[PDB]
Amino acid sequence: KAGSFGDLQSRTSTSNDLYANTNLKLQRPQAGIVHTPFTQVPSGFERWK
Amino acid sequence: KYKTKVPSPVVKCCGATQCTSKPHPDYQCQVFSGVYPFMYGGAYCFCDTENTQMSEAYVERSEECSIDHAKAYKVHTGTVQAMVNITYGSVSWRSADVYVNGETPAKIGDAKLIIGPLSSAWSPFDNKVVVYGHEVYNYDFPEYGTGKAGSFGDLQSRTSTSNDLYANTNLKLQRPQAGIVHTPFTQVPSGFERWKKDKGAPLNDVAPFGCSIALEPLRAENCAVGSIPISIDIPDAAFTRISETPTVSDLECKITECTYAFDFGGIATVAYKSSKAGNCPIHSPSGVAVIKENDVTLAESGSFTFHFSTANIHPAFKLQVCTSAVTCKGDCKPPK
Amino acid sequence: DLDTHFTQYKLARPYIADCPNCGHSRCDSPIAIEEVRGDAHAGVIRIQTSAMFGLKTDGVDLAYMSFMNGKTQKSIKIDNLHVRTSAPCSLVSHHGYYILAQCPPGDTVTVGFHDGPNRHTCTVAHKVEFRPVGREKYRHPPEHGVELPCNRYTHKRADQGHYVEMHQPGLVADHSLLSIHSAKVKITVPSGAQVKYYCKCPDVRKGITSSDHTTTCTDVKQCRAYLIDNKKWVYNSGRLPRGEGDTFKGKLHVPFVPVKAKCIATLAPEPLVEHKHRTLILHLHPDHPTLLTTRSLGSDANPTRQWIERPTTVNFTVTGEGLEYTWGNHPPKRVWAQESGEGNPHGWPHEVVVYYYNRYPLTTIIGL
Amino acid sequence: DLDTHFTQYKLARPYIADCPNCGHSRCDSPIAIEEVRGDAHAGVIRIQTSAMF
Numbered sequence: 001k002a003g004s005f006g007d008l009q010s011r012t013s014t015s016n017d018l019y020a021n022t023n024l025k026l027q028r029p030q031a032g033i034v035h036t037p038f039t040q041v042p043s044g045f046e047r048w049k
Numbered sequence: 050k051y052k053t054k055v056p057s058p059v060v061k062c063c064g065a066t067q068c069t070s071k072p073h074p075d076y077q078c079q080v081f082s083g084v085y086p087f088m089y090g091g092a093y094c095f096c097d098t099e100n101t102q103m104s105e106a107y108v109e110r111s112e113e114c115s116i117d118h119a120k121a122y123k124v125h126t127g128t129v130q131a132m133v134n135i136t137y138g139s140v141s142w143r144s145a146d147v148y149v150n151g152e153t154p155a156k157i158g159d160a161k162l163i164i165g166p167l168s169s170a171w172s173p174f175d176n177k178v179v180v181y182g183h184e185v186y187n188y189d190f191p192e193y194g195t196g197k198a199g200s201f202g203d204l205q206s207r208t209s210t211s212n213d214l215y216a217n218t219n220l221k222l223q224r225p226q227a228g229i230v231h232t233p234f235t236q237v238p239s240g241f242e243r244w245k246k247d248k249g250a251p252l253n254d255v256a257p258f259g260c261s262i263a264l265e266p267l268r269a270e271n272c273a274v275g276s277i278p279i280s281i282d283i284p285d286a287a288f289t290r291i292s293e294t295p296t297v298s299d300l301e302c303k304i305t306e307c308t309y310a311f312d313f314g315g316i317a318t319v320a321y322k323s324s325k326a327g328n329c330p331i332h333s334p335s336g337v338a339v340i341k342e343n344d345v346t347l348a349e350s351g352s353f354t355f356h357f358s359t360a361n362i363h364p365a366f367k368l369q370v371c372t373s374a375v376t377c378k379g380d381c382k383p384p385k
Numbered sequence: 386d387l388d389t390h391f392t393q394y395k396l397a398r399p400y401i402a403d404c405p406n407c408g409h410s411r412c413d414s415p416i417a418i419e420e421v422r423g424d425a426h427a428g429v430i431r432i433q434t435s436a437m438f439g440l441k442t443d444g445v446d447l448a449y450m451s452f453m454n455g456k457t458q459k460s461i462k463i464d465n466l467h468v469r470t471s472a473p474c475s476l477v478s479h480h481g482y483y484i485l486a487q488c489p490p491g492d493t494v495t496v497g498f499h500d501g502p503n504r505h506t507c508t509v510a511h512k513v514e515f516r517p518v519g520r521e522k523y524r525h526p527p528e529h530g531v532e533l534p535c536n537r538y539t540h541k542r543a544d545q546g547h548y549v550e551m552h553q554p555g556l557v558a559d560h561s562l563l564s565i566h567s568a569k570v571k572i573t574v575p576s577g578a579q580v581k582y583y584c585k586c587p588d589v590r591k592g593i594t595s596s597d598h599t600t601t602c603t604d605v606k607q608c609r610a611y612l613i614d615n616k617k618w619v620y621n622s623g624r625l626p627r628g629e630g631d632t633f634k635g636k637l638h639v640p641f642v643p644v645k646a647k648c649i650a651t652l653a654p655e656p657l658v659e660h661k662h663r664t665l666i667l668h669l670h671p672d673h674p675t676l677l678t679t680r681s682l683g684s685d686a687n688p689t690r691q692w693i694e695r696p697t698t699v700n701f702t703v704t705g706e707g708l709e710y711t712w713g714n715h716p717p718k719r720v721w722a723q724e725s726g727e728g729n730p731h732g733w734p735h736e737v738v739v740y741y742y743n744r745y746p747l748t749t750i751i752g753l
Numbered sequence: 754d755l756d757t758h759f760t761q762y763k764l765a766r767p768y769i770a771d772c773p774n775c776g777h778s779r780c781d782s783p784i785a786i787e788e789v790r791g792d793a794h795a796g797v798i799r800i801q802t803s804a805m806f
Binding site: 055056057058059060062066086088089090091092093094095096101103104112113116117182225229230231232250254255256257258259309310311362384385 | 401403413424456534536547552555556557558559560561583607609610611621622623624625626627628631643644645662678680681682683684685686688690707709717719721723724725726730
Binding site: 042047 | 696
């Protein structure tokens with residue numbers, strides 16, 4: 001659910017099946033800075049929390 | 050923004066000096082009697098009633114003014130022009146620019162351009178429009194001569210270098226006291242700055258017809274409204290004969306299919322036999338099904354297809370090909 | 386540079402002033418607060434106090450506060466001053482008399498050099514702000530994203546386009562020179578200090594470098610000892626009496642200059658947007674309030690203005706005329722709304738009735 | 754304990770990193786900020802930097 005409520009889309013705690021999407025997208029590292037600028041989704045289920 | 054400085058406030062042991070018209074905007078000065086102010090490790094600057102304190106003042110201008118100040122305009126009739134691209138006949142991209150006036154004689158290659166002028170006759174502007182930075186704002190009227198209490202005319206000046214401050218910070222002095230050498234006072238806060246908190250939506254952001262503006266000329270940018278009576282000369286030498294041409298015959302076109310969509314979302318073909326092979330244009334005098342094609346080769350028995358969009362659920366129309374207008378009605382069309 | 390710095394330092398001296406401190410509402414330190422000026426987009430503050438700082442009185446040792454220690458003038462190390470507004474100040478630099486530091490937002494500066502017996506501090510309330518990130522409401526300047534112009538006091542101290550006149554100093558009353566003659570007053574002048582003194586009778590109100598003393602006031606009380614000086618040159622003020630010297634309009638540069646620089650904020654988060662043909666629904670779950678307008682591309686605008694930070698949504702519809710929209714650093718975009726026919730031209734007569742109801746929304750209805 | 758501490762310290766070294774400080778937006782200290790983690794009810798924060806401490 002875009003991670004909106006299914007932030008951890010997994011059968012169990014130990015079920016390491018994350019059928020969830022934080023919609024992680026990278027941005028270009030630049031400015032001579034070694035980094036990984038990016039974007040992704042805030043923890044939506046927490047947002048409901 | 051303005052600025053406000055203070056000269057040395059006068060002082061004695063007794064008596065008083067005098068306040069003058071030290072020429073500054075909103076400048077003030079007032080004697081102050083029995084001042085009795087002390088100085089650190091001093092002797093109070095008197096033996097008695099000091100009586101000597103002028104609290105002479107001064108108002109001046111800020112320094113951002115250099116970098117940043119108002120840009121208050123009167124906007125007059127002016128002109129319109131525009132750039133085009135011609136890719137005619139045998140000619141490729143020839144992008145050309147010219148003024149709206151229905152007179153402009155402009156020749157590019159063999160194209161003696163004469164343009165418009167445009168049917169429509171307006172752009173959203175105003176005589177009294179101001180601007181900071183990239184932004185720009187119709188200020189109803191910048192009250193130029195009239196000092197607006199500094200509320201917007203905080204720097205009421207013709208230019209940056211025009212040192213004519215017909216503005217009023219309403220500077221008023223208060224009595225220095227408490228043995229403190231100072232010039233307690235009051236004046237107006239930078240009102241135009243106060244609005245620089247209340248800035249609004251720049252006109253470019255409000256300009257309809259989804260079109261924009263250029264900074265230096267106030268060039269409005271492509272609010273595509275109206276019609277343009279253009280007039281262009283062509284190379285009559287670029288012509289050829291009519292009889293030498295591979296001739297049409299055996300006219301028929303198959304309306305394969307179109308769905309009414311933006312892209313030329315309809316394909317249809319022809320079935321035909323030619324006099325002899327070659328090439329020949331297919332103009333759309335009726336651009337109902339907006340043809341992807343405008344000119345195609347015409348091989349012997351040119352029996353081939355093309356693409357086009359019309360909003361129609363179905364037309365029944367026709368258009369031209371190789372100086373031979375043929376009819377392909379236009380089947381029923383799906384939506385998206 | 387140093388040459389404009391030496392212009393500053395060649396003929397200017399420190400001084401002190403009764404800075405309205407906060408420990409006991411007032412303080413006469415050389416650290417006397419003045420020249421409060423912070424208006425860069427970074428919120429840096431170029432200031433200066435009653436005393437020369439940064440460089441020593443010659444114009445060297447940027448860590449030598451050429452400060453008016455009491456009556457005298459001194460240049461000691463600038464080893465430790467607590468640079469702190471409401472929060473610890475993000476100090477950058479200084480220049481001699483001038484100081485160019487930055488601070489976080491807040492309202493009150495808390496600064497004073499750690500002399501060791503005292504800070505000699507002077508403190509002043511002045512609300513502090515972070516320059517908002519252009520098109521958006523935020524707190525921090527984003528490390529990357531969208532690059533924007535942003536004003537700033539240029540840290541360079543090599544200026545002479547700006548200037549301040551090192552005014553002729555003036556008068557100073559004193560008490561200590563009026564020693565006792567073992568029976569009455571006894572002036573004691575260090576050097577060239579024509580200290581105006583007036584006991585009960587008129588003494589030399591022109592002042593003396595001599596040790597002259599008059600029995601007209603056996604008491605040292607009425608005796609009004611007043612020094613005058615013009616050694617170096619400082620600019621006058623309201624918190625400065627009418628000094629005898631109304632001269633020395635030596636326009637000494639101010640080092641730094643408010644200049645428009647460029648600095649980078651970050652773009653907005655894209656929203657959720659769904660072409661429910663005949664409309665579109667727009668949903669964003671952002672981290673700060675920006676604004677989105679929606680200006681009609683037709684004969685009108687009818688736009689939107691609003692600022693929201695929290696997960697949100699909205700629906701809208703338009704003709705194929707497109708329409709403006711941009712929330713956050715997002716550029717404006719404009720898209721025709723179509724792919725919505727919603728009607729069958731020919732079915733049953735009741736069907737074609739629903740069509741001549743729907744083929745147009747309303748023109749159908751008025752025609753009907 | 755110390756034994757897991759010695760597991761930490763036996764074969765690990767410090768380092769530094771260009772921590773985006775606030776004095777001039779960036780800094781290469783061994784104090785390079787990292788491991789930001791505070792989620793206790795007391796709001797305590799267990800962290801760690803580029804260098805052993």
